[PDB]
Write a protein that binds this ligand. Sequence first.
Ligand SMILES: [Zn+2]
Lengths: 39, 267
Amino acid sequence: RNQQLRTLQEECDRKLITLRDEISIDLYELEEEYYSSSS
Amino acid sequence: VSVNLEAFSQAISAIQALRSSVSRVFDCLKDGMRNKETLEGREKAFIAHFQDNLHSVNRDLNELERLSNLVGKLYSQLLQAYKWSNKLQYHAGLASGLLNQQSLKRSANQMLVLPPQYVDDVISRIDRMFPEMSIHLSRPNGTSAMLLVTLGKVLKVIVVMRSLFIDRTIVKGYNENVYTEDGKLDIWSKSNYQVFQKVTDHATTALLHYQLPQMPDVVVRSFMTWLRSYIKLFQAPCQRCGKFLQDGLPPTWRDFRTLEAFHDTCR
Ligand SMILES: [Zn+2]
């Protein structure tokens, strides 16, 4: 039971970390676009 | 070795100087005394010029003797290409320096994504040089690489990158535990001493200062070049006040582009 639950936890954390990195790259692009907007 | 090249060119100019100074002695003596209004003044001028010329001959002979004490020991197409290659290389170095000092580019506009393998290759290339710095990459949180740069028995720098571009740095002392309880890097800490908090501040200005827009290899290489100069902490005195200690601080400021020690109060 312990080993199965540890594997599920590790899968969830790998998914979250990769999500954070991709969202961070998108946030960088959006920050550049929004702050450099002329308006 | 290059020192023999410089000593030989030096002594070439020494012989030319000796020959011309001897000929200058005899040429000024050929003309004879000039007029120069006051009689006392003309005697003074002639004596002074003759004495100066003789002294210059003696100095040139002495310099030639000193270089003697210090001296050590189809085919034309290849040498012509060699000479022209060195000429083009030096010409291009000077012209590139003059032009990138004064660029006229105002904006990038007209009218980050990297494999982590590339980051490891770049940082291992930097770690191969500077034999007193060891860089140990690890990735505890995703693709953002975290670096421990140890530096002599002096520093431990924790550099937190983001896509092969330095983001944050924390400088701690040698003994200081940079690891947490679980043996991961302590990315968020301070260093219990005044000196290393000052060097964290100077390192953040260093990563704000060395900013090329596109190419990041020059940035990390130049940051490590600047960081390497901190090995003479606690040994270098300040180049403004001479002393080692201002308010109990060593000179924590290694100046960019001329790595000299200063207390930050001495700017
Ligand atoms: Zn000072």
